[PDB]
Scaffold this active site. Sequence first.
Site, PDB file in Angstrom:
ATOM      1  N   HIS A 111      30.981 -17.943 -19.159  1.00  0.00           N
ATOM      2  CA  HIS A 111      30.118 -17.001 -20.154  1.00  0.00           C
ATOM      3  C   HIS A 111      30.639 -17.615 -21.162  1.00  0.00           C
ATOM      4  O   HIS A 111      30.589 -16.791 -22.665  1.00  0.00           O
ATOM      5  CB  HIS A 111      30.158 -15.785 -19.730  1.00  0.00           C
ATOM      6  CG  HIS A 111      29.187 -15.485 -18.719  1.00  0.00           C
ATOM      7  ND1 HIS A 111      27.958 -16.868 -17.915  1.00  0.00           N
ATOM      8  CD2 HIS A 111      28.259 -14.214 -17.993  1.00  0.00           C
ATOM      9  CE1 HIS A 111      26.784 -16.208 -17.195  1.00  0.00           C
ATOM     10  NE2 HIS A 111      27.267 -15.227 -17.335  1.00  0.00           N
TER      11      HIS A 111
ATOM     12  N   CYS B  32      25.837 -30.009 -32.849  1.00  0.00           N
ATOM     13  CA  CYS B  32      26.580 -31.295 -32.111  1.00  0.00           C
ATOM     14  C   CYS B  32      27.383 -31.116 -30.846  1.00  0.00           C
ATOM     15  O   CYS B  32      27.881 -31.612 -30.668  1.00  0.00           O
ATOM     16  CB  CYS B  32      27.268 -32.210 -33.216  1.00  0.00           C
ATOM     17  SG  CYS B  32      28.637 -31.434 -34.375  1.00  0.00           S
TER      18      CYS B  32
ATOM     19  N   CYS C  21      26.903 -31.795 -39.089  1.00  0.00           N
ATOM     20  CA  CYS C  21      25.856 -31.917 -38.900  1.00  0.00           C
ATOM     21  C   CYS C  21      24.914 -30.784 -39.566  1.00  0.00           C
ATOM     22  O   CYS C  21      23.662 -29.815 -39.664  1.00  0.00           O
ATOM     23  CB  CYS C  21      25.589 -30.729 -37.460  1.00  0.00           C
ATOM     24  SG  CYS C  21      25.151 -29.732 -36.988  1.00  0.00           S
TER      25      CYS C  21
ATOM     26  N   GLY D 165      31.613  -6.606  -8.477  1.00  0.00           N
ATOM     27  CA  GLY D 165      30.769  -6.079  -9.756  1.00  0.00           C
ATOM     28  C   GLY D 165      29.861  -6.826 -10.596  1.00  0.00           C
ATOM     29  O   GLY D 165      30.263  -6.847 -11.282  1.00  0.00           O
ATOM     30  N   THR D 166      29.035  -7.296  -9.388  1.00  0.00           N
ATOM     31  CA  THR D 166      28.039  -7.907 -10.786  1.00  0.00           C
ATOM     32  C   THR D 166      26.684  -7.895  -9.304  1.00  0.00           C
ATOM     33  O   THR D 166      26.519  -8.203  -8.130  1.00  0.00           O
ATOM     34  CB  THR D 166      27.907  -8.981 -10.408  1.00  0.00           C
ATOM     35  OG1 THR D 166      26.702 -10.307 -10.999  1.00  0.00           O
ATOM     36  CG2 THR D 166      28.120 -10.300  -9.974  1.00  0.00           C
TER      37      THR D 166
ATOM     38  N   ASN E 245      29.954  -4.638  -4.108  1.00  0.00           N
ATOM     39  CA  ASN E 245      28.991  -3.965  -5.417  1.00  0.00           C
ATOM     40  C   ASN E 245      28.396  -2.922  -4.325  1.00  0.00           C
ATOM     41  O   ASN E 245      28.415  -2.732  -3.633  1.00  0.00           O
ATOM     42  CB  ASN E 245      28.103  -5.005  -5.640  1.00  0.00           C
ATOM     43  CG  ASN E 245      27.360  -4.941  -7.184  1.00  0.00           C
ATOM     44  OD1 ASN E 245      26.157  -4.434  -6.585  1.00  0.00           O
ATOM     45  ND2 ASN E 245      28.198  -5.253  -7.904  1.00  0.00           N
ATOM     46  N   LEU E 246      27.788  -1.624  -5.591  1.00  0.00           N
ATOM     47  CA  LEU E 246      27.231  -0.192  -5.220  1.00  0.00           C
ATOM     48  C   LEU E 246      26.108  -0.620  -4.600  1.00  0.00           C
ATOM     49  O   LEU E 246      25.103  -0.134  -3.419  1.00  0.00           O
ATOM     50  CB  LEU E 246      26.683   0.215  -6.466  1.00  0.00           C
ATOM     51  CG  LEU E 246      28.909   0.629  -6.619  1.00  0.00           C
ATOM     52  CD1 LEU E 246      28.567   1.880  -8.225  1.00  0.00           C
ATOM     53  CD2 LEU E 246      29.121   1.796  -5.574  1.00  0.00           C
ATOM     54  N   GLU E 247      25.565  -1.669  -5.017  1.00  0.00           N
ATOM     55  CA  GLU E 247      23.959  -2.629  -3.963  1.00  0.00           C
ATOM     56  C   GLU E 247      24.022  -4.014  -3.560  1.00  0.00           C
ATOM     57  O   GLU E 247      24.708  -4.446  -4.072  1.00  0.00           O
ATOM     58  CB  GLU E 247      23.392  -1.982  -4.985  1.00  0.00           C
ATOM     59  CG  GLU E 247      23.111  -0.671  -5.646  1.00  0.00           C
ATOM     60  CD  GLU E 247      21.516  -0.347  -6.663  1.00  0.00           C
ATOM     61  OE1 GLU E 247      21.813   0.269  -7.032  1.00  0.00           O
ATOM     62  OE2 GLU E 247      20.770  -1.268  -6.653  1.00  0.00           O
TER      63      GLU E 247
ATOM     64  N   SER F 101      34.841  -1.669  -7.357  1.00  0.00           N
ATOM     65  CA  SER F 101      35.490  -2.220  -7.469  1.00  0.00           C
ATOM     66  C   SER F 101      37.048  -1.620  -7.610  1.00  0.00           C
ATOM     67  O   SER F 101      38.199  -2.179  -6.502  1.00  0.00           O
ATOM     68  CB  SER F 101      35.617  -3.730  -8.861  1.00  0.00           C
ATOM     69  OG  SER F 101      35.892  -2.348 -10.018  1.00  0.00           O
TER      70      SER F 101
HETATM   71 ZN   LIG Z   1      27.391 -29.428 -36.250  1.00  0.00          ZN
END
Ligand SMILES: [Zn+2]
Lengths: 289, 289, 289
Positions: free
Chosen positions: B125, B136, B163, B205-206, B230-232, B252
């Site tokens: 992420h 760009c 840009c 954990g997700t 995970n809890l679920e 976790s």
């Molecule tokens: Zn740019």
Amino acid sequence: GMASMSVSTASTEMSVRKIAAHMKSNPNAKVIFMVGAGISTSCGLARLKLPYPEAVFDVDFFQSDPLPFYTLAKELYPGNFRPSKFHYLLKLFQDKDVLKRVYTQNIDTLERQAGVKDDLIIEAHGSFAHCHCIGCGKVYPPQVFKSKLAEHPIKDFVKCDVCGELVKPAIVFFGEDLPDSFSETWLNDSEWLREKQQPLVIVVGTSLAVYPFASLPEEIPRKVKRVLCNLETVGDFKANKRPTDLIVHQYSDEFAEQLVEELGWQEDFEKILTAQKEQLLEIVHDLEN
Amino acid sequence: GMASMSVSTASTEMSVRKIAAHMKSNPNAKVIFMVGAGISTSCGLARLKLPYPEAVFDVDFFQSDPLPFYTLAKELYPGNFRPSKFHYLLKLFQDKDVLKRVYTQNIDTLERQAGVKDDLIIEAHGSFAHCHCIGCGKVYPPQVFKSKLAEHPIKDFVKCDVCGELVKPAIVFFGEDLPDSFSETWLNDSEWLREKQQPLVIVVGTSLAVYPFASLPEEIPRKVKRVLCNLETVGDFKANKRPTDLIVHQYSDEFAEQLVEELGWQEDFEKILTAQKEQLLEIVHDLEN
Amino acid sequence: GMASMSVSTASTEMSVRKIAAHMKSNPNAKVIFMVGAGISTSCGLARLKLPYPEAVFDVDFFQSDPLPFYTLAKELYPGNFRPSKFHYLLKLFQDKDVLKRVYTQNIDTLERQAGVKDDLIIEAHGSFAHCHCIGCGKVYPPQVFKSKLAEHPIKDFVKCDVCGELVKPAIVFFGEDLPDSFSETWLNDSEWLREKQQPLVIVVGTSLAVYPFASLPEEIPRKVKRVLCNLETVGDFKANKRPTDLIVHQYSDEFAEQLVEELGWQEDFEKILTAQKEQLLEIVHDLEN
Ligand SMILES: [Zn+2]
Ligand SMILES: [Cl-]
Ligand SMILES: [Cl-]
Ligand SMILES: [Cl-]
Ligand SMILES: [Zn+2]
Ligand SMILES: [Zn+2]
């Protein structure tokens, strides 16, 4: 992008925005709708011992004893009610030449009532437009059956003058196949989708519990973005969620108001609104009281 | 055996034992981890009218009005907090040369904070390590953006000198693609898995609700044993359960303590602990208060 | 028709009627049953510190310390109880030469107790019929083990005189493979199904949480109609529902009474009744108290 970071359900506001966004950057891209009893809910002797609740709408039971369906039939014919805001959203889309088709499980003819052209309407569950024989498939005008529903309580039941089997209005009962136009048109719109990714398939107001209609969402080309507007995630959106699925836990009318607002068609929509489980199981439910 | 009698969820104690068991009888077999906001939870003007809650982290909204993200950005940069026990479990595994990779959706850099080598960390992420142009794709040093977050309230927003488009920290927003290293490395570790059945993929954990990261578990080779802590039960473990899946409804940190105990690494772990929804949606949540 | 309008769960009465209907229009079509602890529920020192609850039935734990299983084993052997109405429904079907096979996860031998021929019974989870060595697979008569369960508290544990490894009754423990007859017969009945669509597979009284048995329903040929009689939709009926699936949220005994009534075999059934989680986890549950 189909691989861009995204969320499954998300907030109503963002979902509606993404849908309008998709349409704005994809003009000249029609939308296919698949709808259920939920788009007509925002608009609202008796019973005499049945083996099971759904027997009145069961082709087998009807075949052996049609008296109960005849008794309730009079109350089923479509009246001349007012279509919901959602139904008018369908009309709005047509005007903007962006409505490819409406597949409906409802038999209230409210989509036609709203001005949607018959060419774009697919009544997957039949209609009262005519009658048919449950034996040879012979078709008859509505009058034949509607006629008997006026003759005292009943002297006898309409029958096919070619095979002798019972005749009834063309609303699909449990146990019957849906009309050819359904599978045939879906096949057509299905390849149409395959040809184009700019289209959208919006499923609204159905728990997707009645088959084969409930198989439409899973057959939507995995490359076409699908939307679900329902108070609960159901059917294939729950069982086989796709990265690009957009779920909106909202009522169909509110959903219509918000999508129109985001597209910027409030005026055309207000003008239209000014000038101009599934239904069978719901009824079955009320019977049991 | 993959066809030996077994139970889906089972008791935490047995699940943890089976995992350690698998590792003991499969030494020289690395483990791939896939983690979310849940491994950092055990460690904990303002807001001014947004169209929708997640707009601050929406690339589209940002593109038209970056003022809100700038306003909150200062509070997002990674501080120098203490990694959880689970994060240290990752370090422990590395020391034992049994950690193949950590795929994380978190942007708190706590896995790196714990001592995990960058080579084994995949920040699916993004991170604040640098800035980039949303136009760009040009990259810039962190200072460029962090700089503006010091100049009075704001005179203007950093922009790409090639840009003209906006520049922001390299944390993936909703609507953006994840960095090449993600899909590229997963492809690498994916074939790696295919080559070896002695490896394990532990998802912890997700809720697996953010895509495309949420597609990793289903792509795990059906022949490789996968674990969910995970809890679920969520995502693919719920939708397409596999006979060999091991689910542990545990926190976790506790999970880390128990796995270490079962492997018999309590000492090495205690030494390390001595000497040395997802995060974006969570923040979005707090905003709405 | 597999494309005729239908409902997923429907009312018990209609489901039972459709099943009888299917059998009436499909005589000379056998039925395969797949059953769990739920068809025997309608018929109903101590414990001394275990690492985890299911350890008594865990092949690994047993391998290192069999004392706990020996301590409980005496209470496990099948008594001479009365089979439930459902078990007798199996006998009834056999008499009508319409029972192709019964796959059971139970080790209470109640299906055999009811008169079902051994040829039609598949005890997927083993039985006390004999003992075996957890090492070489050598088989021994029941007496060998039952013998030791009479010698004071215990002097030692039965062992294989060929490999020295422990011997125990042939009930499959967690961690062991099921007997060859299981997979082999399923393969046989599986092709049998493929050959015929007139057959039916009725899954009753199991949460489908124990593998590999829980994989049977998904392997049922998609062209063969499958029925689930369980208080809750579970396993593959929940995860990958099929248009033709019939779900009956009913108790196995009531279900038996209603199906017999609909088929019109009340007399033959009453005559038989006159003259003549899963079980391991349930026990494990009671232990923890
Ligand atoms: Zn740019
Ligand atoms: Cl077109
Ligand atoms: Cl390696
Ligand atoms: Cl046969
Ligand atoms: Zn006819
Ligand atoms: Zn042996």
